[PDB]
Amino acid sequence: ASDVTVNVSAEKQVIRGFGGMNHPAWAGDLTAAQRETAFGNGQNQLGFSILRIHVDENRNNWYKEVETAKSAVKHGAIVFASPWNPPSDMVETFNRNGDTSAKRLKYNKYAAYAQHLNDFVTFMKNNGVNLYAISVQNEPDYAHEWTWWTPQEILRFMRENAGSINARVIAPESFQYLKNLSDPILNDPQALANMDILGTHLYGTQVSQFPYPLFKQKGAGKDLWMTEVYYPNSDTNSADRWPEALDVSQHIHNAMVEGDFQAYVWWYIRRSYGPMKEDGTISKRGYNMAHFSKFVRPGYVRIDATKNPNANVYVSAYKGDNKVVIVAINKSNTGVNQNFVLQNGSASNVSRWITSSSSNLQPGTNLTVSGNHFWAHLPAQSVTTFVVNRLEHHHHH
Ligand code: NA
């Protein structure tokens, strides 16, 4: 087998966090018990560090988001919001390639719409939630059941109106990371100045389409977030299927390593194909997310690691708070011994947690680092998170 080399000094993207969507109207709000399970980081809890909520078109419905959003903030999670439709008085039908039922924001209502979004941010502030960011539109390019925007309509709003919003602005949330939706923003200095986070979803997106050269070229000082997906499917009662659920950890691995994403946000938190089952317990898919969420905390930085050392073995690594975190996925039917070589970072002790067909985030035996490396066995069809405690602690005292 080939080594994995982890270079603690070769820094990649800063991680904002991991989480999922709450939607009281569409899915039913998380209960008090479920909010603890989602946002707390104790045993049997997901440690989600990001919550997404929706901006209702009717402001008389905004109060419904408050309790779950307050619990996220209490647990130190950041909250962001995406709208699906403007208030209906601002919306018109138009002819979209023969579809006369298609809806858009009226061109003379762009200022009114920006004011609506700013009013949501204010409402949340007045209810003890300082919203981290707000989106211009959920999936403007897949809007049969909501509000369509062309790349040029998004551009005009980003130039002229987005600067009025008193919060970080996310755009354009393509359903599939279609670059035609976001290229105009990146290519227009005015619009770009008013974007804080480039957000996308990944529905049907192939891994070859996770990289984005134009964002690397033009996006300095901007964040890159994966704001909604479910994966590999939304099959009813699929969340505990093994080894299918391992596809979730691999998808996050690809988002981190191929996409350089700084946030990974699932669709509904509680759902039969989601990270929390309808009974309020964590699903196998949920434990796959928790291998990242519980350990790679906000502000950690991804670091260079051999990403695919052997067939069916996927590895990523992160550092923060005097720790190095390594997530190693084995999607084969053979347990394998894997050597982890650490560069530019002295350590002695390694703790690990393992999810497998009959075990959920369960502690394995401690390993010892000798001569700057350690061997660890990765069981067949499993994901392991290692936590390496470093020796050189800086800052103060
Ligand atoms: Na701004």
Return the structure tokens found at 305. Answer: 């690691």
CA distance 131 to 50: 11
Whether the CB-CB separation of 287 and 252 falls below 8 Å is answered with: no
CA distance 217 to 212: 9
258 alpha carbon – ligand 1 mean position (Å) = 28
CA distance 202 to 227: 9
The structure's method of determination equals X-ray
356 alpha carbon – ligand 1 mean position (Å) = 45
> Which neighbouring-strand residues pair with 386?
326, 352
384 alpha carbon – ligand 1 mean position (Å) = 40
Q: Which residues of 296-325 are buried (b: 16+ CB within 10 A; e: fewer)?
A: bbbebebbbbbbebbebbbbbbbbbeebbb
Question: Residue type at 195?
Answer: M
15 alpha carbon – ligand 1 mean position (Å) = 21
The distance from CA 220 to its chain's CA centroid, rounded to whole angstroms, is 20
Vertex 66 angle, CA 61 and 72, to 5° = 145
> Which neighbouring-strand residues pair with 225?
199
- Alpha helices per DSSP H over 194-347: 213-218, 246-257, 284-293
Return the structure tokens found at 280. Answer: 């309020």
Name the residues annotated as catalytic. Answer: 139, 228
Among 397, 380, 367, smallest CA distance to 333 is for: 380
Resolution in units of Å: 1.6
191 alpha carbon – ligand 1 mean position (Å) = 10
Residues near 90 by beta carbon (within 8 Å), at least 6 away in sequence: 105, 106, 109, 112, 113, 116
What letter would DSSP give residue 151?
Answer: H
Strands 4-14 and 301-305: antiparallel
CA distance 19 to 9: 27
CA distance 147 to 183: 20
166 alpha carbon – ligand 1 mean position (Å) = 7
CA distance 291 to 15: 14
Helices then strands, counting H and E runs in the chain, come out as 10, 20
292 alpha carbon – ligand 1 mean position (Å) = 30
What letter would DSSP give residue 204?
Answer: T
Work out whether the CA dihedral 234, 235, 238, 243 comes out positive or negative: negative
Angle between helices 246-257 and 284-293 (to 10 degrees): 30
44 alpha carbon – ligand 1 mean position (Å) = 39
CA distance 237 to 307: 31
Question: Residue type at 370?
Answer: S
User: What length is written for the chain?
Assistant: 397
68 alpha carbon – ligand 1 mean position (Å) = 27
Return the structure tokens found at 338. Answer: 């894997």
Q: Could you count the other beta carbons within 10 Å of the beta carbon of residue 219?
A: 17
281 alpha carbon – ligand 1 mean position (Å) = 39
CA distance 46 to 355: 14
CA distance 28 to 65: 11
Q: How far is CA 26 from CA 23, 31, 54, 217, 267, in A?
A: 6, 15, 10, 39, 12
- Alpha helices per DSSP H over 100-178: 110-126, 151-160
SS3 17: strand
164 alpha carbon – ligand 1 mean position (Å) = 7
By CB atoms closer than 10 A (0-12, 13-18, 19+), residue 221 is exposed
Structural domains for the chain: 1-15+299-397 (2.60.40.1180), 16-298 (3.20.20.80)
264 phi/psi in degrees, rounded to 5:
-135, 115
End-to-end CA distance of the chain: 42
The distance from CA 159 to its chain's CA centroid, rounded to whole angstroms, is 26
Strands 323-330 and 50-55: unpaired
Return the structure tokens found at 160. Answer: 């002229």
162 alpha carbon – ligand 1 mean position (Å) = 7
Among 267, 289, 310, 257, smallest CA distance to 383 is for: 289
SS3 135: strand
